[PDB]
Symmetry: C3
Subunit: 240 residues, 3 copies
Amino acid sequence: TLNAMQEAYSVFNALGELAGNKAIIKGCVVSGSTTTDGVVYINGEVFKFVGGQTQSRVKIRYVTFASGTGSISWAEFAKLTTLRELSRRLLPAGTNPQLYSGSVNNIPSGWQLCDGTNGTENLKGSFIVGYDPNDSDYNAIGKVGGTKKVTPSGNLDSRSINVTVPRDGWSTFGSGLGAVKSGRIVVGSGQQENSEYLESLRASGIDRTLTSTPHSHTFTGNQQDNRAPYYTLAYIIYIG
Amino acid sequence: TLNAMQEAYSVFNALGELAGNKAIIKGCVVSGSTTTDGVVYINGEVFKFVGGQTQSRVKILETSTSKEFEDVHFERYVTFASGTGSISWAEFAKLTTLRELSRRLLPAGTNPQLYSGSVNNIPSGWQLCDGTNGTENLKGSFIVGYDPNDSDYNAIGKVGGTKKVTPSGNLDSRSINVTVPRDGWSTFGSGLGAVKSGRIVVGSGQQENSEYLESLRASGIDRTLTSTPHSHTFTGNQQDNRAPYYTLAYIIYIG
Amino acid sequence: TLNAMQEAYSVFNALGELAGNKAIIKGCVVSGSTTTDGVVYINGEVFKFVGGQTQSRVKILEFERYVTFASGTGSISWAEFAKLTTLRELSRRLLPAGTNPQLYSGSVNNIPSGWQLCDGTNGTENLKGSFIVGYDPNDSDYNAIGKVGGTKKVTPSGNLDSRSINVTVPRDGWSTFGSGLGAVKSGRIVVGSGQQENSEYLESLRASGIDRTLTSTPHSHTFTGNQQDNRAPYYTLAYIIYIG
Ligand SMILES: [Mn+2]
């Protein structure tokens, strides 16, 4: 019965495959130039690892340091994170959206788009912003805002122009008076008045630099893209 | 003492629970119409798996250790089979190794995560990326990808941007033209007489039977003038610089 | 041999390190007021766990025999024992290599083994300098993975309407130059002196009656905007991805 009571326990070597080929199951920690004792798994077999002075290469009953044949690079052996630690690093289902660049038509089993269905956040078309308990814009999960496009707007101040109306250069029409069209400006002829002196008239004295009534203009802005350089990725989440 | 021995090693079957029920522990690799031999875990027992032609169901068989019956001790194993006690083979899962899971695990404190759960019930070992305990303070921020070749983004933690912005700009300078007419000034009062000092004198349209006034003429032309240039100052209204956003918490695993 | 064989199966205790110290391997579930039996791993040894009424502490009893609820010197807080997620469940929560970019705040010069920056090399997305936006099957801007757009800066643009300017030419305020006529420069506007004509009566003349409000041809101005920063408050993190 000892044959049946050896083959029965021998199947436990295969449990090393849960760690993976060339995994360090236990121990094998570096001190200085020495690696501590431990347990390794190689090609379907669980081995006690007898340490001592490090030799960057190992060989195989137990595993110890070597070089030559059948030398295995000790760099190929990996230390593991425990299932306890992996479980602690696992966030509750439905709370941890993930970035996804794979096929949107082949979302992995148990996963879905964060689209508002099945209790998910609807993250479609959104830029994420960090929750901030002290900012009213971001002090709760799911607070939204922002716009894809914006149109600039603004005002112009009111301004006047100046124009100088000259007292000179109006030219002349017709002859001495005589008559002048009613409401038509009268000018000098350049000639002295004959036999008479006109005290009621004078040459104009100055040009007139006039200021216009103020005016402004309406500004009509063109729509612009409010988005910083973006890259589309899907937000997916594990449901179960 | 062999009772204590069996009871001792039998506890190792419980290690299959690390994989979970109906796990493929080792082997059982598909090769066309074939599945290789391997090791499986079902209902608290670790079993050798005997492969062959892939079938939809498997079962625990108990057969004689003597594999020939020419002219009795049993062994238990799992194989492709059918009927009472058989299990759908599709319920058996191949696993990712702990070595591979460890390689996919980023160091503590280096991997911020999106979180939509309760901010008052952040899981054990995790905290908000708030600047405490050596974390990045990601509160109120939009993340931008590190770029070693862009001075805006060439270090972790480089910040910039503004929630609000005010557009600004300039206007060019323009002149206008205006035509001053020699006609249409109308009239006020009567013959001279007197006219207000510095007030434009115009024709009355009347002709007296008098000595001609040689010192005067009707004006000859209208006057087209160009103004001095002018511009305007633009005062922009503040605008929201943010694209459509959604608030999520950035959390990180510390330990 | 009841020794070199007992030594042979004892090595399997080290497989409990895959779960980790104080792991609940199997069972030990709250079933009302009681905790079920199971298997636990403590200090390099796999032990059978004997249950009962949920106690706060446990002990190794006869060390190398079993674990059960017991308090006092030698006891271990039961709360230090952790239930585990199976490898089957961890495998289901594992996304395919190359499909899952991750935020990274560690050293950019020491990116972990098997990981790389999402920089466009080795079939990766080039996420350098980008703000991520969620895929949306209903929005043509975001209806395929990797659609891009947006700009770091923007320059506002716009137009001004056309307006005409008015100016009023006054009939008064031209002042005077020189004396009575006499003579006035040819083509120079004649104004009143404010004095009565002495001997003559000038019926051919009158004071002007009105000021003249004139309108210009319409004008506009060209607006030239200043460049502005299009980014909302940002924080630089690296996007990395697991390749293999
Ligand atoms: Mn203007």
